[PDB]
Amino acid sequence: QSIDPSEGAVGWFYKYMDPAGAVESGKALGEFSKVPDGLLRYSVDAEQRPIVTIECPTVSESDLPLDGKLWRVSFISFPAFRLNFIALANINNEALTLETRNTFIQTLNNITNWRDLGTGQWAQFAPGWYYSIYVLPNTYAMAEIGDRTDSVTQFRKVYKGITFEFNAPTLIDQGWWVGAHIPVKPQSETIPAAERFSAGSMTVSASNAIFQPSNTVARIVWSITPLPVATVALTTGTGGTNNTSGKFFSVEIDGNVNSVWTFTAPASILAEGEPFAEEGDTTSFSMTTITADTVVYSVSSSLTGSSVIVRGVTKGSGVSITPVTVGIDTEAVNRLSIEMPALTTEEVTTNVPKYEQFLCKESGGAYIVHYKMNNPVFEMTGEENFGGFQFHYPGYDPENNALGLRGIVDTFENNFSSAVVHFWGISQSATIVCKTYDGWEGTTNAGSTVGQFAHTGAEEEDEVVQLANRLQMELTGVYQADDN
Amino acid sequence: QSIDPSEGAVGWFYKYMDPAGAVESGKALGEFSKVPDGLLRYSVDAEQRPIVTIECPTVSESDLPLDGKLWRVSFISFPAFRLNFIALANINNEALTLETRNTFIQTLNNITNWRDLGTGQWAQFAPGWYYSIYVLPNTYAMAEIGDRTDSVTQFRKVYKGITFEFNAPTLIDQGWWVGAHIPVKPQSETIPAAERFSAGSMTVSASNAIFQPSNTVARIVWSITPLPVATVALTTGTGGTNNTSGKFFSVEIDGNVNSVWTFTAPASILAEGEPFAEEGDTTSFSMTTITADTVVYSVSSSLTGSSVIVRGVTKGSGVSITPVTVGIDTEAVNRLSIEMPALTTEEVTTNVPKYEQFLCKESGGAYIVHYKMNNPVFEMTGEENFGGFQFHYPGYDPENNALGLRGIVDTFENNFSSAVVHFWGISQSATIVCKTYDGWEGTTNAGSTVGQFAHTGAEEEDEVVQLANRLQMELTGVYQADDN
Amino acid sequence: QATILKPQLLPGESVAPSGGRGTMDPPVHEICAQSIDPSEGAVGWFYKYMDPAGAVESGKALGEFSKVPDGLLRYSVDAEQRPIVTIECPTVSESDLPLDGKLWRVSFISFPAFRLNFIALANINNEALTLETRNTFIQTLNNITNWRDLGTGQWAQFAPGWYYSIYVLPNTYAMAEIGDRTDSVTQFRKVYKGITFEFNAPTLIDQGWWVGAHIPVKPQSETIPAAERFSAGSMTVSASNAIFQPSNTVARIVWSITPLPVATVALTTGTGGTNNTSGKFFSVEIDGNVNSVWTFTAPASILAEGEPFAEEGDTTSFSMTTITADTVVYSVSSSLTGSSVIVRGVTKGSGVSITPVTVGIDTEAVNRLSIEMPALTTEEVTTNVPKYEQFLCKESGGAYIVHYKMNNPVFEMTGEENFGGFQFHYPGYDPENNALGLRGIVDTFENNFSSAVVHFWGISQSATIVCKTYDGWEGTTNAGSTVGQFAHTGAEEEDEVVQLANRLQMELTGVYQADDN
Amino acid sequence: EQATILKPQLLPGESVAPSGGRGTMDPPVHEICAQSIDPSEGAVGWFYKYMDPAGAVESGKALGEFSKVPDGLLRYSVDAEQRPIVTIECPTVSESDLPLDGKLWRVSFISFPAFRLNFIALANINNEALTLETRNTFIQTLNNITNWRDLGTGQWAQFAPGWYYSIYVLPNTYAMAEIGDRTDSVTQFRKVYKGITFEFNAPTLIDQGWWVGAHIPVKPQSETIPAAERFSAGSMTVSA
Amino acid sequence: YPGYDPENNALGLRGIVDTFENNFSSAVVHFWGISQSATIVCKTYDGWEGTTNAGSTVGQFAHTGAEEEDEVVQLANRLQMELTGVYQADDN
Amino acid sequence: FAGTVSALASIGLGLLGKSSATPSVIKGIAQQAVGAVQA
Amino acid sequence: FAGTVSALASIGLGLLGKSSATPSVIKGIAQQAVGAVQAN
Amino acid sequence: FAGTVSALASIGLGLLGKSSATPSVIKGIAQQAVGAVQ
Amino acid sequence: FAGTVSALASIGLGLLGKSSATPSVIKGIAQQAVGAVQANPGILEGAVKAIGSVGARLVGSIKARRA
RNA sequence: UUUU
Ligand SMILES: [Ca+2]
């Protein structure tokens, strides 16, 4: 009898190790979402196992074509509370130009109501590139301000680990990948709280619409930084609108240069140092021009003498921003500056040594497993570092960063590796099933539902953990899917 | 080897474990206020045991009316450096509704020169609500750069033990209570430092002045954030002016509608896109209408052309914020977004399973022992999370937050769990004595007095510390008072 | 004793002819004992972490000593920078006697910062520091604008008898903070840091003594807002004196402007004597007489005292009306007709004159780090610190200082979290005197390690200090990292040792003599 | 057999002050005593790397500081491996559909032991024979590249109709800026070894393809771009 | 190149900039009949050693040079030459 | 009980010293300190 | 029960169970688990 | 199989380790790492 | 004493060598290494000299070689 | 011839 850890430890150990084999091997037992470090009076442990089948952007989940065309897809898993990972893509087989990646990022740093994206639905930020956000449901499920409004004080990822099965017909298995865990930490660059007038900005990302006149009709994602959300709708022209759900203003719409949607100001707005429109005034948005790479947008205010806006925007490129100033009050919220885990196959292979690449055919996919990679011990990310995921990367210049509460709004698990899995030359006709076995331990402050299964913290089992930790620093964290 | 630990490390043990009983059980040995993690090369360990007499907001201290009437009173204890804890009370045993709740909150975040409540004395904040703050003498004593200034580079609560003795005549020795620990980390929402001008807000709370014609008079405490403390004196009418020790501008007044207070502006002011005063104008604030329920006020200045100002404030609940800009400058100083520990007897149960509850009659009150819950080690909590915390909570609309440096400004223990204790069926004829054995250990950087007491950080007593938080873990941070 | 070797393939792993990983965890030459088997890196580290400078010349250094043996990082790059700087008196105090028995004071602040080594400030006269004296100092380090253009270790006057310089760490400093070419790594830890302050003095007048003491400091990210159309800024004019020329005639103000873009200031109308930065923001180093006037094309719109002053295509002209041997009056002039001139009173060698400016320039948000300047007081240290040591420079041929995991019991990974513009606060110090925009030092501050200072006192103008520093940092590289190509597996956890170390350290004073080096 | 040597920090007879002396210590040499020699892993490791820079690592022969040619030439030295892995793909004409029984490409690589640069790609979509014109059009191109770093992103680049090339650099060395404001590099340098494995990322069945490889030396004989002042002659190119 | 007019050459300092290992062999590896849908992962391994000077962001990673093992080197040399530098991407 | 917690610890700490400090022992002690009387 | 990575645990966890519990020892198992060895 | 080269690299190297390392002696090895004397 | 530190630490590590690293023992070992407790000649100090006499001596000697 |  050297030591006797209770199931909840073992089950844990094995999980914070092989969160797939753990379960698969029935090795996962006991209340394993709790780290046997014994640090909590009480704690709610949990394991969200999303299985999302990341299919190629322009593909029919139905009658998939045995195309034989390709596509890049990079996954950047982050140890965030209600955020699984981000999916980068590229139908046309093309590399990541600085232009490209810089466009990418800025997109993610200026995503008005990131919630509107929880669908993990694909979004075209660049001519051949798309992205999307998959979330850890159950957590995301707990409505931020909620209806039953369950609120978690602090938490801590107990084990990320997700496998990216290479769902591909032997016909077309042409594929290869490479993962690697790169730690990341958020520096709370705070967005200030103002009183009568708080500043913000107006973003407009233009692109072509699927199955639409690549020069006659273009889709943009018009939004406004601190502006209260308001409903829009085409007023005159070729239909095509998709409103936001968030508390701020944003909208996606398709249409020609003749098309004009409008909405009513939720509050006063200044623009180019000029009162653009007040509460009432109904603002209109249209396109002086529309091409295949550019679009002149222009917003007309109902206000009297309200000079209107005119702006050039290369669709597929960045977001042309128009600084704004709304008469609304704003709470100071935190933006989180976050390095962006090496987005390039090489960038990754040369700077990270513990990476591990594979041919999809042989490695039935990919299986990364994060781990407490920062704090030698499981501290407890809480309010500590929560905010608007606003990333940077080498090259990226913030010159094109949104002034408003944008980006992915969550809490980054302070101590824990965020990883990257790049899948290169995957068959158009193939998809990546992503079963993540993510788990966390947190505390409840107010709610009506969660604080029920809140129990006592795991029994402090050093040796166990000790070992667990050894194996981590020890391993790659990236394995053949066949090893989950 | 016997596993021999310094007799002072043992002191720390019980102290941490039972900060109150340890003293009584004489188990309080050596410099028990230093944490035996063998971390610090040196350090100062201190332990204040400040005792507070909590009386029912209206009930006298002199004469005890045996009303056989009750009142709900709760305390929120924070591992804040100088802040001992906060307490709020309802003179009608009433429930904390939303608005009441939010108002409560709202207030705490808009507490201008919070140092003004250093005095345990209450402060109405709602129809039947009062609240007050309890500072830790010796620390609170640490005047932040004044005349007499000393300082600490960082610290970490070595333990906190509060015991709310149920001081109630056995006669109406009735009522009950619920205690529970909820760990909370703060987030640094920043209050941008500015130059020529600084945005701010002019708050003006309003509520009946105990012992004055309800419908006639009204006691109100209006302040103006960036605006430097101004000495207000009643100008014309029925008396009632309590000024502030504070560094900014705030004052509590009461009186007839026609009553007038006035002070000179120590710096230029702006309100509603307009100017209001020069660094020499004579600002005049008075009331228009006084309703036992509502209240209209309006301020003006000697500024030639200075428009007047007017807004209303339903007495007893909330403040009338006024987006303002001051002619002085702000410091980087940021607030601390802090989740508010379940204020309702409801959630506490529905969220903290290792919470306890007894009747005040048997359990001579409630005794809580705070413990390192945040991270598994005694990390040092320094400057990193210091600032005017403003509590956020579901329901609470940030909109209501002031704009300047308000709230209880202090440092938060990035480790210790915060705890709240709600007393419900208490009789006004009862008072809750609060023994507070709270002891921190930090390091000095500049000072003339504390230095001489700094010695060596307690040797690494790994074995004890080990079990220490092991017990605290499996143990309810709450306990029967009489068990101290 | 013996060597260990882990397999590319984990028991059972079935890789293809080109799969797997690309690394091969360099072998484990862990030494053996009756109870433990630390790897030479683990061991070397122990000694290095303990007696950095010594353990090396002590022969006890070895293996990945620049890596921490707490098997935390799966992969990590690491190293040590041993920059050796020679601090020596700033004023060429001209004396006529054959024996200018002059003495000077000097002190160093060590910050376990990624790119920063330590700071230093001396007083030509052995005079101690005054409150306001100290303050100016402080407010200067906060107002330093294009700080990078100071790492040269160059001396800088901020006070009358006071100068100060900052020393980077050769390489980490050699890693830029621009979006184009160089960006730091995802995070790191100060694996150990020590410095010897060799008392290089003529064994004739070896007078002097010094006090050393470690003080921990944790930064506070008091962040700057991200502006859009316009941005708030601060126009700084720190008036100073020509190290040689007549005070009552010539001044040596440094003139920078918080968010305004660096634009070449050429002296046009005046006598001459300028030296502009290369930093991203606009700053200038210039000395001259009254009539003199420098110029430059304003990179962007500029407001001030409400009314607009300049526009992109405008040309600002800065001059000085009066130059008392100690006070200075100046003027700022815009092309843009309809604008009025700016004037302000300063006091060379004293606080700066601020000018709440506004620049028509989008403003990236970046935090400023509110860091309590460690006891700089001749005798404050002596008080708030019991673990401080001190001897005469003569005896202790200098000072030896060894930092340690001070703040966290264990070795976290100080990452980007606390990174930004160092802005030091202190008691009696007023921040109103703090410059706006992103200025001051900029670096990732190892929040775990012990900050620490050492003041030398009563030494000779002749005596100089050779600061042999041994900085050991380890961190994880991300992209573009000009170093990622050096990272390997992270040290294995040999806490057995580690703890010991921690005890020693704790048990010990991070200060010693340059003879115990 | 095993051995571990330690070069003292001092020299026989040197009397050294505490404070000073040598600042760097010497990483201990570990030698594999053999009946005829006892190299250090930094040798063998190298040896192997130099010999089979990939299988030596995949195999488990890459020992120590193998990125250092064991020839006691340098007193001090910087060693380092770079394992960038780019997945050169066929270029884009258009989402112009693609039948398996159809299209394919030709792609060639030229690898030079250049410090920063890794290798040069080149491919022809419709699969072309390098015609003379095609060649020149290419070469002329590589040459006339202005801010060569502009494409260091390893991004495809057209030039000839249906012809595209690209440049891949050593991600970490490319990372080290040249003649920049305050930026510059190392003194000398020397490839310690360099190999590349162009893994054939192909569907199990559409495994169609053939490649050829060969080592051919090439040495750069320099020609100069003279400095000047008032005006420096040059030229402006414009490709289509 | 054999059959190229240096007329098409750009004047000024353009072209790929860099230092060339005036020691190693350069190579070429042409591939044909590669289905568009097939791609090539180019996993490289470039080792190199130099002597840092100033501002080098690497001087730290610097230290003692490799000792002379021509005793072994030799083999490696006469070994390489002994064979092609070209092999199967299943022998690495 | 005059600081039940206090004594409740004395017991846990008592056992500790007068017994090896196995990181795993401890647990059983802390556990015995209240619930599971370790064997 | 496909987990290799997992096997690589129960293997060491296996040992640990009857291992001296020394963290030094833990290192031992933790390397054995990876299936490491003492070369020569 | 993967590392085919490092195979001989071993045979070769290894062989050396025992042989009377000599340019000649050596060559012979480098030759044995593949060739046969016919 | 060049590296009196590492030397000090060196010894303590030495003890740790045999001593089963029990935080309890480690403590003692640490306490010991410093010289605080349980020490024997496994101790050493100021071997160098203050120039005063270092200098003065060689001044006394130059010619006083008669002995 | 030797102390340090
Ligand atoms: Ca922390």
PDB file of N, CA, C and O and ligand atoms in Angstrom, chain A residues 185 375 379 384 414, chain B residues 185 375 379 384 414, chain C residues 218 408 412 447-448, ligand 1:
ATOM      1  N   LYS A 185      -1.300  33.530 -22.905  1.00  0.00           N
ATOM      2  CA  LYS A 185      -1.835  34.223 -21.750  1.00  0.00           C
ATOM      3  C   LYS A 185      -2.338  35.582 -22.195  1.00  0.00           C
ATOM      4  O   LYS A 185      -1.696  36.265 -22.996  1.00  0.00           O
ATOM      5  N   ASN A 375       1.150  27.492 -14.753  1.00  0.00           N
ATOM      6  CA  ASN A 375       1.346  27.402 -13.321  1.00  0.00           C
ATOM      7  C   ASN A 375       1.767  25.980 -13.060  1.00  0.00           C
ATOM      8  O   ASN A 375       1.126  25.042 -13.504  1.00  0.00           O
ATOM      9  N   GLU A 379      -3.712  26.772 -10.426  1.00  0.00           N
ATOM     10  CA  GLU A 379      -4.238  27.994  -9.817  1.00  0.00           C
ATOM     11  C   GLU A 379      -5.702  28.022 -10.214  1.00  0.00           C
ATOM     12  O   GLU A 379      -6.253  27.004 -10.609  1.00  0.00           O
ATOM     13  N   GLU A 384     -10.395  37.040 -12.816  1.00  0.00           N
ATOM     14  CA  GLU A 384      -8.988  37.290 -12.962  1.00  0.00           C
ATOM     15  C   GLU A 384      -8.658  37.730 -14.384  1.00  0.00           C
ATOM     16  O   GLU A 384      -8.085  38.797 -14.590  1.00  0.00           O
ATOM     17  N   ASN A 414      -6.088  30.862 -17.588  1.00  0.00           N
ATOM     18  CA  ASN A 414      -4.742  31.275 -17.222  1.00  0.00           C
ATOM     19  C   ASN A 414      -3.708  30.181 -17.511  1.00  0.00           C
ATOM     20  O   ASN A 414      -3.108  30.146 -18.584  1.00  0.00           O
TER      21      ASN A 414
ATOM     22  N   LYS B 185     -12.190  36.123  -7.574  1.00  0.00           N
ATOM     23  CA  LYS B 185     -11.005  36.813  -8.038  1.00  0.00           C
ATOM     24  C   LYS B 185     -11.566  38.087  -8.678  1.00  0.00           C
ATOM     25  O   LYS B 185     -12.712  38.111  -9.148  1.00  0.00           O
ATOM     26  N   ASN B 375      -5.789  29.631  -5.436  1.00  0.00           N
ATOM     27  CA  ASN B 375      -4.810  28.717  -5.978  1.00  0.00           C
ATOM     28  C   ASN B 375      -4.218  27.864  -4.874  1.00  0.00           C
ATOM     29  O   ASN B 375      -4.098  28.310  -3.741  1.00  0.00           O
ATOM     30  N   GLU B 379       0.335  31.998  -3.217  1.00  0.00           N
ATOM     31  CA  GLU B 379       0.915  32.998  -4.087  1.00  0.00           C
ATOM     32  C   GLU B 379       0.836  34.345  -3.396  1.00  0.00           C
ATOM     33  O   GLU B 379       0.039  34.539  -2.484  1.00  0.00           O
ATOM     34  N   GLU B 384      -0.796  44.057  -8.355  1.00  0.00           N
ATOM     35  CA  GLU B 384      -1.516  43.438  -9.478  1.00  0.00           C
ATOM     36  C   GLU B 384      -3.037  43.560  -9.453  1.00  0.00           C
ATOM     37  O   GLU B 384      -3.652  43.828 -10.481  1.00  0.00           O
ATOM     38  N   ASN B 414      -5.651  37.513  -3.901  1.00  0.00           N
ATOM     39  CA  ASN B 414      -5.763  36.687  -5.087  1.00  0.00           C
ATOM     40  C   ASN B 414      -5.869  35.214  -4.708  1.00  0.00           C
ATOM     41  O   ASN B 414      -5.870  34.354  -5.571  1.00  0.00           O
TER      42      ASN B 414
ATOM     43  N   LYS C 218       5.221  43.564  -7.618  1.00  0.00           N
ATOM     44  CA  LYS C 218       4.348  42.999  -8.621  1.00  0.00           C
ATOM     45  C   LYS C 218       3.761  44.199  -9.360  1.00  0.00           C
ATOM     46  O   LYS C 218       3.380  45.198  -8.748  1.00  0.00           O
ATOM     47  N   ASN C 408       5.795  34.140  -5.972  1.00  0.00           N
ATOM     48  CA  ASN C 408       5.027  32.898  -6.003  1.00  0.00           C
ATOM     49  C   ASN C 408       5.846  31.804  -5.331  1.00  0.00           C
ATOM     50  O   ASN C 408       7.048  31.739  -5.509  1.00  0.00           O
ATOM     51  N   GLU C 412       5.623  30.096 -11.572  1.00  0.00           N
ATOM     52  CA  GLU C 412       4.612  30.287 -12.615  1.00  0.00           C
ATOM     53  C   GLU C 412       5.360  30.658 -13.895  1.00  0.00           C
ATOM     54  O   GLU C 412       6.594  30.583 -13.961  1.00  0.00           O
ATOM     55  N   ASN C 447       6.906  38.375 -12.842  1.00  0.00           N
ATOM     56  CA  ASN C 447       6.190  38.597 -11.598  1.00  0.00           C
ATOM     57  C   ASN C 447       6.542  37.640 -10.472  1.00  0.00           C
ATOM     58  O   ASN C 447       6.126  37.841  -9.339  1.00  0.00           O
ATOM     59  N   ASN C 448       7.313  36.609 -10.765  1.00  0.00           N
ATOM     60  CA  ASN C 448       7.660  35.672  -9.720  1.00  0.00           C
ATOM     61  C   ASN C 448       8.885  36.078  -8.941  1.00  0.00           C
ATOM     62  O   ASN C 448       8.904  36.012  -7.711  1.00  0.00           O
TER      63      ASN C 448
HETATM   64 CA    CA K   1      -0.972  34.223 -10.873  1.00  0.00          CA
END
